Amino acid sequence: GITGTWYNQLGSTFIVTAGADGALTGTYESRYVLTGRYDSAPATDGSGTALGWTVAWKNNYRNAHSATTWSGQYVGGAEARINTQFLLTSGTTEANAWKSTLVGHDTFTKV
Amino acid sequence: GITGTWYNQLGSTFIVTAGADGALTGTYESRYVLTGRYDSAPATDGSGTALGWTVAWKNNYRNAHSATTWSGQYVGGAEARINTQFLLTSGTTEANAWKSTLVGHDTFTKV
Amino acid sequence: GITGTWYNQLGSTFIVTAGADGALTGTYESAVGNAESRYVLTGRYDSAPATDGSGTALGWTVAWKNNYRNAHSATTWSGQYVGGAEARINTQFLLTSGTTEANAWKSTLVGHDTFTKVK
Amino acid sequence: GITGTWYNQLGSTFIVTAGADGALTGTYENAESRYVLTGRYDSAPATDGSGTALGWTVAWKNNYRNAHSATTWSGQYVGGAEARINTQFLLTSGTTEANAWKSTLVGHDTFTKV
């Protein structure tokens, strides 16, 4: 139930393919390459499915010298969702290294 | 460069290949598949190179039902360093989700 | 505006007073974790925030020791108050447990809490 | 072992007093660089060699300056010769709703008696 199109509440879109080898591949909409990993054999006791992915914010058109990683879980059901916390790291000089990383969270629905 | 064998303070071992257009692939070590991305065209001003990667903690011997993502930057220097912050998420029930995610930091060197 | 009784989405209660010195004092009751009854909190807040529609930065700490139990840990919430039709305090938290050096790598939990004046 | 003066490696200092029941009060630092702190610590920690859980907050406003922000530090004290306080922090800035997603920085810092 992870494969498909997911939306957060701020207009972002990601299209992911969940591989039988536990790979997560896809696109984060401009448009960037996404890549990560998920638990391909989760428990069936009500627990969600742990997963994570990364996007580096460079494509053919632009480059923000930064990258975001999302760490969370997939919860299936009537209203399937992916609940995440993220770290967004920017390339800084070592003087500014303490202020390099933002932390936040985001929920995705199949909306 | 980024490509190489890296070690953290706790003795972990991280083997990466940095690809031509932003891919990170390799193994984390009990050896697990990692995947990520990096800024393939960083600043020329002394800024570091932003990157991130994910490991899902299942292999052909163990499954902890959890995933860790690392977000950081590569600093090229006399000692080349990769400085990160990580999020380790565990599959929980949604009543336990509040204690699902650990946060910490890690520094890798080629030594 | 911050002074009042606040509840999170889990049923916990946050009774606080915002003083004029930027101080925050009060009591926290958690609905989850190793805890029971009330614990003391203290923190700080921006007593003169920007006029441009931004919110009010604040933070506080609870050490989870009271007369009923000791979880050997503390939590800090960091966030901002947003005054509006639906007044709300949005935070992120760090919960640190005392550990030995060996497991300090797993001493800290991070999550996010939203508080509202209506339960 | 907590009461006193602590230093990080980026040229910052805090002076704390740890009161008998888990209170922490002090200053984070010239006058224009001085700010008030307050937090709590576990006043009856385990004797198993585990550290002492603590946390504190500084809002970045004093009599001269206002950064419209607050940092909370969450961590543990470890006694001994190299007495250390190991923390992770969260630094939140007041933003607009639109930019709340970029309001909070996360990082780590270590404090020593020397």
GROMACS .gro file of C-alpha atoms in nm:
model
  455
    1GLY     CA    1   0.000   0.000   0.000
    2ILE     CA    2   0.295   0.238  -0.020
    3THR     CA    3   0.330   0.249  -0.398
    4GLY     CA    4   0.148   0.545  -0.551
    5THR     CA    5   0.097   0.921  -0.519
    6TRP     CA    6   0.102   1.096  -0.184
    7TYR     CA    7   0.018   1.455  -0.091
    8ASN     CA    8   0.106   1.671   0.207
    9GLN     CA    9  -0.109   1.963   0.316
   10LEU     CA   10   0.120   2.223   0.160
   11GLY     CA   11   0.088   2.138  -0.209
   12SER     CA   12   0.376   1.891  -0.238
   13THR     CA   13   0.339   1.566  -0.428
   14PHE     CA   14   0.549   1.255  -0.434
   15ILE     CA   15   0.522   0.950  -0.655
   16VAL     CA   16   0.699   0.646  -0.516
   17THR     CA   17   0.760   0.288  -0.614
   18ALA     CA   18   0.804   0.041  -0.325
   19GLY     CA   19   1.026  -0.240  -0.453
   20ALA     CA   20   1.018  -0.603  -0.349
   21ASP     CA   21   1.377  -0.550  -0.241
   22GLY     CA   22   1.282  -0.277   0.004
   23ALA     CA   23   1.380   0.010  -0.224
   24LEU     CA   24   1.183   0.333  -0.245
   25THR     CA   25   1.219   0.515  -0.578
   26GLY     CA   26   1.047   0.813  -0.726
   27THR     CA   27   0.997   1.180  -0.771
   28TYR     CA   28   0.927   1.469  -0.532
   29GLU     CA   29   0.744   1.757  -0.696
   30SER     CA   30   0.973   2.179  -0.934
   31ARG     CA   31   1.073   1.806  -0.976
   32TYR     CA   32   1.344   1.618  -0.790
   33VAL     CA   33   1.473   1.263  -0.759
   34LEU     CA   34   1.384   1.074  -0.443
   35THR     CA   35   1.536   0.756  -0.300
   36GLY     CA   36   1.511   0.552   0.025
   37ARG     CA   37   1.429   0.228   0.202
   38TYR     CA   38   1.134   0.061   0.384
   39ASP     CA   39   1.069  -0.247   0.596
   40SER     CA   40   0.961  -0.509   0.344
   41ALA     CA   41   0.840  -0.752   0.614
   42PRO     CA   42   0.654  -0.559   0.880
   43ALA     CA   43   0.480  -0.701   1.183
   44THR     CA   44   0.105  -0.759   1.156
   45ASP     CA   45   0.024  -0.655   1.510
   46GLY     CA   46  -0.106  -0.306   1.437
   47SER     CA   47   0.242  -0.155   1.409
   48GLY     CA   48   0.321   0.072   1.116
   49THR     CA   49   0.585   0.013   0.852
   50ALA     CA   50   0.909   0.205   0.912
   51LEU     CA   51   1.064   0.382   0.610
   52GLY     CA   52   1.281   0.676   0.502
   53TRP     CA   53   1.380   0.872   0.191
   54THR     CA   54   1.612   1.151   0.081
   55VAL     CA   55   1.587   1.434  -0.172
   56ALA     CA   56   1.887   1.650  -0.275
   57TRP     CA   57   1.757   1.984  -0.402
   58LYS     CA   58   1.937   1.997  -0.732
   59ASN     CA   59   1.804   1.915  -1.076
   60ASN     CA   60   1.882   2.032  -1.432
   61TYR     CA   61   1.722   2.371  -1.359
   62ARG     CA   62   1.831   2.464  -1.013
   63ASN     CA   63   2.037   2.387  -0.705
   64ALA     CA   64   1.973   2.489  -0.347
   65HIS     CA   65   2.284   2.325  -0.199
   66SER     CA   66   2.071   2.131   0.047
   67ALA     CA   67   1.909   1.792   0.115
   68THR     CA   68   1.614   1.664   0.316
   69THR     CA   69   1.572   1.325   0.476
   70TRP     CA   70   1.232   1.205   0.602
   71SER     CA   71   1.205   0.928   0.863
   72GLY     CA   72   0.864   0.789   0.956
   73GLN     CA   73   0.610   0.518   0.923
   74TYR     CA   74   0.334   0.403   0.692
   75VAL     CA   75   0.002   0.318   0.859
   76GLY     CA   76  -0.253   0.144   0.640
   77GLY     CA   77  -0.631   0.139   0.670
   78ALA     CA   78  -0.934   0.344   0.564
   79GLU     CA   79  -0.729   0.664   0.579
   80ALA     CA   80  -0.379   0.545   0.497
   81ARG     CA   81  -0.107   0.794   0.591
   82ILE     CA   82   0.269   0.839   0.613
   83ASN     CA   83   0.382   1.016   0.930
   84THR     CA   84   0.732   1.167   0.918
   85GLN     CA   85   0.986   1.391   1.082
   86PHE     CA   86   1.243   1.551   0.856
   87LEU     CA   87   1.590   1.704   0.871
   88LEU     CA   88   1.681   1.966   0.606
   89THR     CA   89   2.056   2.028   0.590
   90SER     CA   90   2.216   2.317   0.401
   91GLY     CA   91   2.576   2.346   0.290
   92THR     CA   92   2.739   2.611   0.511
   93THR     CA   93   3.091   2.716   0.604
   94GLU     CA   94   3.212   2.560   0.927
   95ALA     CA   95   3.141   2.886   1.110
   96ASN     CA   96   2.772   2.849   1.027
   97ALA     CA   97   2.763   2.474   1.081
   98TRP     CA   98   2.559   2.498   1.402
   99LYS     CA   99   2.276   2.657   1.207
  100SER     CA  100   2.290   2.411   0.915
  101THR     CA  101   1.996   2.184   0.998
  102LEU     CA  102   1.621   2.241   1.033
  103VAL     CA  103   1.387   1.986   1.189
  104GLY     CA  104   1.017   1.940   1.123
  105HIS     CA  105   0.737   1.695   1.046
  106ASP     CA  106   0.494   1.622   0.767
  107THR     CA  107   0.198   1.395   0.707
  108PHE     CA  108   0.115   1.252   0.365
  109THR     CA  109  -0.224   1.108   0.264
  110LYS     CA  110  -0.332   0.934  -0.056
  111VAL     CA  111  -0.585   1.218  -0.064
  112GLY     CA  112   3.595   1.261  -0.225
  113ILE     CA  113   3.270   1.124  -0.078
  114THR     CA  114   3.330   0.786  -0.237
  115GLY     CA  115   3.509   0.558   0.007
  116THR     CA  116   3.497   0.371   0.336
  117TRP     CA  117   3.395   0.585   0.634
  118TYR     CA  118   3.384   0.507   1.006
  119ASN     CA  119   3.196   0.669   1.293
  120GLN     CA  120   3.301   0.717   1.653
  121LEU     CA  121   3.114   0.405   1.768
  122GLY     CA  122   3.292   0.179   1.519
  123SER     CA  123   3.028   0.162   1.250
  124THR     CA  124   3.149   0.124   0.893
  125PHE     CA  125   2.990   0.296   0.593
  126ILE     CA  126   3.086   0.214   0.235
  127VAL     CA  127   2.957   0.457  -0.032
  128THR     CA  128   2.981   0.528  -0.402
  129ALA     CA  129   2.883   0.882  -0.501
  130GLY     CA  130   2.744   0.879  -0.854
  131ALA     CA  131   2.763   1.123  -1.141
  132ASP     CA  132   2.419   1.274  -1.093
  133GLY     CA  133   2.354   1.268  -0.722
  134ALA     CA  134   2.323   0.904  -0.618
  135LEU     CA  135   2.463   0.753  -0.298
  136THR     CA  136   2.471   0.369  -0.281
  137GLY     CA  137   2.653   0.127  -0.055
  138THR     CA  138   2.641  -0.072   0.268
  139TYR     CA  139   2.623   0.008   0.638
  140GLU     CA  140   2.780  -0.223   0.899
  141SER     CA  141   2.499  -0.750   1.006
  142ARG     CA  142   2.543  -0.556   0.677
  143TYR     CA  143   2.255  -0.348   0.543
  144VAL     CA  144   2.178  -0.172   0.210
  145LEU     CA  145   2.193   0.207   0.214
  146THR     CA  146   2.072   0.458  -0.041
  147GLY     CA  147   2.085   0.837  -0.063
  148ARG     CA  148   2.161   1.156  -0.254
  149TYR     CA  149   2.410   1.444  -0.248
  150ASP     CA  150   2.466   1.788  -0.402
  151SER     CA  151   2.673   1.708  -0.710
  152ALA     CA  152   2.744   2.074  -0.775
  153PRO     CA  153   2.819   2.249  -0.449
  154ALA     CA  154   2.931   2.605  -0.384
  155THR     CA  155   3.285   2.720  -0.463
  156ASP     CA  156   3.295   2.940  -0.156
  157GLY     CA  157   3.407   2.697   0.117
  158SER     CA  158   3.058   2.565   0.188
  159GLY     CA  159   3.027   2.192   0.251
  160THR     CA  160   2.840   1.941   0.032
  161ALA     CA  161   2.489   1.860   0.157
  162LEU     CA  162   2.376   1.497   0.154
  163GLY     CA  163   2.156   1.234   0.318
  164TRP     CA  164   2.101   0.858   0.322
  165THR     CA  165   1.864   0.593   0.456
  166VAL     CA  166   1.909   0.243   0.599
  167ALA     CA  167   1.611   0.012   0.662
  168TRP     CA  168   1.717  -0.238   0.935
  169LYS     CA  169   1.625  -0.562   0.766
  170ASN     CA  170   1.866  -0.803   0.597
  171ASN     CA  171   1.870  -1.178   0.541
  172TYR     CA  172   1.930  -1.240   0.911
  173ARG     CA  173   1.756  -0.974   1.118
  174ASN     CA  174   1.466  -0.727   1.104
  175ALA     CA  175   1.439  -0.462   1.374
  176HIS     CA  176   1.132  -0.310   1.208
  177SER     CA  177   1.287   0.035   1.199
  178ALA     CA  178   1.472   0.278   0.968
  179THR     CA  179   1.738   0.546   1.019
  180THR     CA  180   1.803   0.851   0.802
  181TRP     CA  181   2.120   1.062   0.824
  182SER     CA  182   2.124   1.427   0.708
  183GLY     CA  183   2.448   1.621   0.692
  184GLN     CA  184   2.733   1.762   0.499
  185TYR     CA  185   3.070   1.648   0.367
  186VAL     CA  186   3.353   1.890   0.450
  187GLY     CA  187   3.664   1.843   0.238
  188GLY     CA  188   3.966   1.925   0.454
  189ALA     CA  189   4.296   1.811   0.602
  190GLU     CA  190   4.068   1.571   0.776
  191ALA     CA  191   3.773   1.506   0.544
  192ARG     CA  192   3.469   1.480   0.775
  193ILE     CA  193   3.104   1.387   0.726
  194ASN     CA  194   2.903   1.557   1.002
  195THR     CA  195   2.545   1.433   1.046
  196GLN     CA  196   2.227   1.425   1.246
  197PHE     CA  197   2.004   1.116   1.236
  198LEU     CA  198   1.645   1.007   1.294
  199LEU     CA  199   1.578   0.643   1.384
  200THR     CA  200   1.213   0.549   1.358
  201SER     CA  201   1.058   0.230   1.492
  202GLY     CA  202   0.734   0.071   1.384
  203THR     CA  203   0.492   0.130   1.676
  204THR     CA  204   0.118   0.128   1.717
  205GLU     CA  205  -0.030   0.470   1.667
  206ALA     CA  206  -0.086   0.510   2.038
  207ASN     CA  207   0.287   0.464   2.089
  208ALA     CA  208   0.386   0.687   1.798
  209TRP     CA  209   0.495   0.963   2.036
  210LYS     CA  210   0.800   0.760   2.136
  211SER     CA  211   0.872   0.621   1.792
  212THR     CA  212   1.170   0.833   1.688
  213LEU     CA  213   1.520   0.881   1.823
  214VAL     CA  214   1.742   1.179   1.734
  215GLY     CA  215   2.118   1.203   1.755
  216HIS     CA  216   2.439   1.290   1.575
  217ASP     CA  217   2.732   1.110   1.419
  218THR     CA  218   3.067   1.207   1.268
  219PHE     CA  219   3.238   0.995   1.003
  220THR     CA  220   3.606   1.000   0.896
  221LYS     CA  221   3.802   0.781   0.654
  222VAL     CA  222   4.006   0.693   0.962
  223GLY     CA  223  -0.257   3.511   2.590
  224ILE     CA  224  -0.021   3.225   2.670
  225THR     CA  225  -0.144   3.220   3.031
  226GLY     CA  226  -0.406   2.950   3.069
  227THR     CA  227  -0.480   2.578   3.061
  228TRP     CA  228  -0.365   2.397   2.749
  229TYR     CA  229  -0.423   2.042   2.624
  230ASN     CA  230  -0.233   1.840   2.363
  231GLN     CA  231  -0.376   1.596   2.114
  232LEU     CA  232  -0.305   1.313   2.358
  233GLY     CA  233  -0.502   1.442   2.654
  234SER     CA  234  -0.220   1.597   2.851
  235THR     CA  235  -0.265   1.917   3.048
  236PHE     CA  236  -0.036   2.220   3.062
  237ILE     CA  237  -0.119   2.483   3.324
  238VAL     CA  238   0.113   2.783   3.277
  239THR     CA  239   0.161   3.148   3.364
  240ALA     CA  240   0.348   3.393   3.142
  241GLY     CA  241   0.504   3.662   3.356
  242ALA     CA  242   0.619   4.004   3.241
  243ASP     CA  243   0.988   3.911   3.278
  244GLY     CA  244   0.961   3.656   2.997
  245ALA     CA  245   0.919   3.380   3.252
  246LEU     CA  246   0.691   3.080   3.216
  247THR     CA  247   0.588   2.887   3.526
  248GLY     CA  248   0.348   2.605   3.582
  249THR     CA  249   0.257   2.243   3.609
  250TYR     CA  250   0.237   1.959   3.356
  251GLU     CA  251   0.025   1.642   3.367
  252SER     CA  252   0.109   1.376   3.110
  253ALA     CA  253  -0.137   1.121   2.978
  254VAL     CA  254   0.143   0.905   2.837
  255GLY     CA  255   0.474   0.764   2.958
  256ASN     CA  256   0.620   0.679   3.298
  257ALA     CA  257   0.433   0.936   3.500
  258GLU     CA  258   0.139   1.024   3.725
  259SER     CA  259   0.001   1.342   3.870
  260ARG     CA  260   0.160   1.682   3.826
  261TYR     CA  261   0.518   1.795   3.758
  262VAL     CA  262   0.670   2.142   3.776
  263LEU     CA  263   0.765   2.324   3.458
  264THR     CA  264   0.963   2.632   3.386
  265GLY     CA  265   1.067   2.822   3.076
  266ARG     CA  266   1.097   3.149   2.888
  267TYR     CA  267   0.913   3.328   2.610
  268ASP     CA  268   0.959   3.637   2.389
  269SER     CA  269   0.784   3.910   2.587
  270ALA     CA  270   0.793   4.154   2.297
  271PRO     CA  271   0.750   3.976   1.967
  272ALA     CA  272   0.751   4.117   1.613
  273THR     CA  273   0.444   4.316   1.500
  274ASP     CA  274   0.456   4.162   1.154
  275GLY     CA  275   0.219   3.867   1.208
  276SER     CA  276   0.487   3.625   1.327
  277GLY     CA  277   0.432   3.415   1.636
  278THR     CA  278   0.586   3.425   1.981
  279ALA     CA  279   0.884   3.199   2.040
  280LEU     CA  280   0.884   3.003   2.369
  281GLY     CA  281   1.021   2.695   2.541
  282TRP     CA  282   0.998   2.500   2.866
  283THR     CA  283   1.130   2.197   3.052
  284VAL     CA  284   0.986   1.929   3.278
  285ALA     CA  285   1.210   1.689   3.476
  286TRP     CA  286   0.995   1.382   3.537
  287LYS     CA  287   1.053   1.356   3.911
  288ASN     CA  288   0.774   1.428   4.160
  289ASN     CA  289   0.661   1.277   4.491
  290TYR     CA  290   0.498   0.975   4.316
  291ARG     CA  291   0.776   0.857   4.082
  292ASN     CA  292   1.104   0.921   3.905
  293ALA     CA  293   1.142   0.839   3.534
  294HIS     CA  294   1.505   0.964   3.528
  295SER     CA  295   1.445   1.193   3.232
  296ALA     CA  296   1.342   1.537   3.115
  297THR     CA  297   1.158   1.685   2.817
  298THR     CA  298   1.200   2.027   2.658
  299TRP     CA  299   0.936   2.173   2.426
  300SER     CA  300   1.040   2.445   2.182
  301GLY     CA  301   0.790   2.632   1.970
  302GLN     CA  302   0.570   2.928   1.911
  303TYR     CA  303   0.239   3.060   2.023
  304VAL     CA  304  -0.001   3.167   1.750
  305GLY     CA  305  -0.283   3.394   1.864
  306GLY     CA  306  -0.587   3.361   1.642
  307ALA     CA  307  -0.944   3.240   1.609
  308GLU     CA  308  -0.801   2.911   1.732
  309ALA     CA  309  -0.518   3.003   1.965
  310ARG     CA  310  -0.249   2.742   1.945
  311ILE     CA  311   0.098   2.648   2.063
  312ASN     CA  312   0.297   2.447   1.811
  313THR     CA  313   0.605   2.268   1.943
  314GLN     CA  314   0.877   2.016   1.887
  315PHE     CA  315   1.019   1.819   2.179
  316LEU     CA  316   1.333   1.644   2.294
  317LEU     CA  317   1.295   1.381   2.565
  318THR     CA  318   1.628   1.276   2.718
  319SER     CA  319   1.668   0.977   2.950
  320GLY     CA  320   1.966   0.921   3.178
  321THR     CA  321   2.180   0.646   3.022
  322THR     CA  322   2.534   0.519   3.052
  323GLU     CA  323   2.787   0.633   2.791
  324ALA     CA  324   2.734   0.312   2.598
  325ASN     CA  325   2.371   0.384   2.508
  326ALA     CA  326   2.372   0.764   2.500
  327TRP     CA  327   2.312   0.728   2.123
  328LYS     CA  328   1.959   0.622   2.208
  329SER     CA  329   1.897   0.856   2.498
  330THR     CA  330   1.687   1.112   2.309
  331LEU     CA  331   1.339   1.107   2.159
  332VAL     CA  332   1.211   1.378   1.928
  333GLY     CA  333   0.845   1.443   1.841
  334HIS     CA  334   0.595   1.723   1.800
  335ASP     CA  335   0.308   1.846   2.012
  336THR     CA  336   0.023   2.087   1.940
  337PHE     CA  337  -0.159   2.251   2.229
  338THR     CA  338  -0.504   2.409   2.217
  339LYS     CA  339  -0.712   2.585   2.486
  340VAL     CA  340  -1.011   2.359   2.416
  341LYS     CA  341  -0.973   1.995   2.519
  342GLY     CA  342   2.847   1.864   4.025
  343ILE     CA  343   2.625   2.081   3.805
  344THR     CA  344   2.634   2.413   3.989
  345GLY     CA  345   2.895   2.649   3.846
  346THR     CA  346   3.040   2.779   3.520
  347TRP     CA  347   3.022   2.581   3.195
  348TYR     CA  348   3.182   2.652   2.854
  349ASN     CA  349   3.117   2.524   2.499
  350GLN     CA  350   3.368   2.533   2.213
  351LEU     CA  351   3.211   2.825   2.026
  352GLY     CA  352   3.289   3.082   2.291
  353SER     CA  353   2.976   3.067   2.502
  354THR     CA  354   2.936   3.052   2.878
  355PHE     CA  355   2.665   2.969   3.124
  356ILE     CA  356   2.664   2.996   3.504
  357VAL     CA  357   2.401   2.784   3.676
  358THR     CA  358   2.279   2.710   4.021
  359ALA     CA  359   2.113   2.373   4.072
  360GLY     CA  360   1.868   2.399   4.362
  361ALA     CA  361   1.773   2.119   4.597
  362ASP     CA  362   1.455   2.021   4.411
  363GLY     CA  363   1.548   2.006   4.044
  364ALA     CA  364   1.554   2.378   3.974
  365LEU     CA  365   1.818   2.524   3.740
  366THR     CA  366   1.863   2.900   3.716
  367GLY     CA  367   2.142   3.112   3.572
  368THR     CA  368   2.264   3.330   3.290
  369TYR     CA  369   2.374   3.249   2.935
  370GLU     CA  370   2.643   3.484   2.802
  371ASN     CA  371   2.930   4.203   2.790
  372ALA     CA  372   2.589   4.298   2.928
  373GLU     CA  373   2.435   4.307   2.584
  374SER     CA  374   2.529   3.944   2.542
  375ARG     CA  375   2.379   3.822   2.867
  376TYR     CA  376   2.051   3.630   2.880
  377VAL     CA  377   1.844   3.460   3.152
  378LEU     CA  378   1.806   3.083   3.162
  379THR     CA  379   1.590   2.842   3.352
  380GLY     CA  380   1.540   2.467   3.349
  381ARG     CA  381   1.502   2.151   3.555
  382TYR     CA  382   1.717   1.848   3.640
  383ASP     CA  383   1.668   1.508   3.805
  384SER     CA  384   1.764   1.570   4.169
  385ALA     CA  385   1.757   1.199   4.255
  386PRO     CA  386   1.923   1.015   3.968
  387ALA     CA  387   2.000   0.646   3.937
  388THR     CA  388   2.322   0.518   4.091
  389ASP     CA  389   2.381   0.270   3.807
  390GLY     CA  390   2.629   0.495   3.637
  391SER     CA  391   2.363   0.657   3.423
  392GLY     CA  392   2.379   1.032   3.365
  393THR     CA  393   2.160   1.303   3.513
  394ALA     CA  394   1.877   1.414   3.286
  395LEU     CA  395   1.832   1.791   3.261
  396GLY     CA  396   1.707   2.067   3.034
  397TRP     CA  397   1.691   2.444   3.006
  398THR     CA  398   1.561   2.732   2.800
  399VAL     CA  399   1.686   3.078   2.691
  400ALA     CA  400   1.462   3.323   2.502
  401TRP     CA  401   1.689   3.564   2.308
  402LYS     CA  402   1.573   3.893   2.454
  403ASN     CA  403   1.747   4.100   2.716
  404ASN     CA  404   1.735   4.472   2.802
  405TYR     CA  405   1.921   4.559   2.481
  406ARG     CA  406   1.841   4.311   2.207
  407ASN     CA  407   1.555   4.086   2.091
  408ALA     CA  408   1.608   3.801   1.847
  409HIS     CA  409   1.245   3.678   1.860
  410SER     CA  410   1.363   3.328   1.935
  411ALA     CA  411   1.425   3.073   2.209
  412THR     CA  412   1.658   2.775   2.236
  413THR     CA  413   1.588   2.471   2.451
  414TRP     CA  414   1.869   2.232   2.546
  415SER     CA  415   1.789   1.874   2.643
  416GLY     CA  416   2.063   1.644   2.765
  417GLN     CA  417   2.251   1.474   3.042
  418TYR     CA  418   2.519   1.563   3.294
  419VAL     CA  419   2.807   1.318   3.341
  420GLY     CA  420   3.024   1.365   3.650
  421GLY     CA  421   3.391   1.276   3.696
  422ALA     CA  422   3.708   1.457   3.599
  423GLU     CA  423   3.589   1.542   3.251
  424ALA     CA  424   3.254   1.651   3.385
  425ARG     CA  425   3.048   1.705   3.068
  426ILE     CA  426   2.697   1.818   2.991
  427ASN     CA  427   2.592   1.660   2.658
  428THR     CA  428   2.293   1.818   2.491
  429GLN     CA  429   2.089   1.843   2.177
  430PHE     CA  430   1.910   2.171   2.118
  431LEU     CA  431   1.607   2.310   1.937
  432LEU     CA  432   1.615   2.675   1.829
  433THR     CA  433   1.279   2.812   1.727
  434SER     CA  434   1.225   3.147   1.561
  435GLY     CA  435   0.895   3.331   1.557
  436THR     CA  436   0.780   3.311   1.193
  437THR     CA  437   0.457   3.356   1.001
  438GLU     CA  438   0.235   3.054   0.949
  439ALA     CA  439   0.359   3.033   0.590
  440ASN     CA  440   0.717   2.982   0.702
  441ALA     CA  441   0.665   2.774   1.019
  442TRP     CA  442   0.815   2.470   0.843
  443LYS     CA  443   1.155   2.645   0.859
  444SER     CA  444   1.124   2.786   1.210
  445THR     CA  445   1.322   2.529   1.409
  446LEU     CA  446   1.693   2.438   1.390
  447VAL     CA  447   1.833   2.128   1.558
  448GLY     CA  448   2.187   2.073   1.678
  449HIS     CA  449   2.410   1.948   1.954
  450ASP     CA  450   2.650   2.104   2.200
  451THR     CA  451   2.883   1.989   2.477
  452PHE     CA  452   2.969   2.186   2.790
  453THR     CA  453   3.277   2.152   3.009
  454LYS     CA  454   3.407   2.293   3.338
  455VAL     CA  455   3.726   2.393   3.155
   0.00000   0.00000   0.00000
